[PDB]
Amino acid sequence: ATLIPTGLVKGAQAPTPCGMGYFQSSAETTTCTACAVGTYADQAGLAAC
Amino acid sequence: PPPTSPPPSPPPSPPPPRPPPPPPPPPSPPPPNRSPPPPPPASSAINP
Numbered sequence: 001a002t003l004i005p006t007g008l009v010k011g012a013q014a015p016t017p018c019g020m021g022y023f024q025s026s027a028e029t030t031t032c033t034a035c036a037v038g039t040y041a042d043q044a045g046l047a048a049c
Numbered sequence: 050p051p052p053t054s055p056p057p058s059p060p061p062s063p064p065p066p067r068p069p070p071p072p073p074p075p076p077s078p079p080p081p082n083r084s085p086p087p088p089p090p091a092s093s094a095i096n097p
Contacts (some may be wrong), residue, residue, distance in 0.1 A: 001090065017096060019093060019094025019095050019096045020094065020095040020096070021092075023093070029075075034090070044095065044096045045068045
């Protein structure tokens with residue numbers, strides 16, 4: 001009707017790392033995957049288990 | 050003459066005592082509890 005944008009909301013400003021016991025091997029991902037059985041995640045932000 | 054009267058029978062010998070029995074072995078120990086309880090999968094973040 002007026003060629004004007006509206007309703008923009010910004011995304012996540014911070015990296016917001018993966019909590020303890022939860023890893024993410026793959027980049028560009030919205031959710032965090034639980035570490036498999038037998039392996040541990042000691043600190044938050046671990047690339048892999 | 051007739052012979053002298055024989056003397057009466059003598060008393061019998063005393064009997065021996067009996068030893069006591071040794072203490073019995075202790076009962077076999079119980080086996081440990083059946084496995085650990087199922088573990089919790091753990092959750093949340095624990096981040097800052």
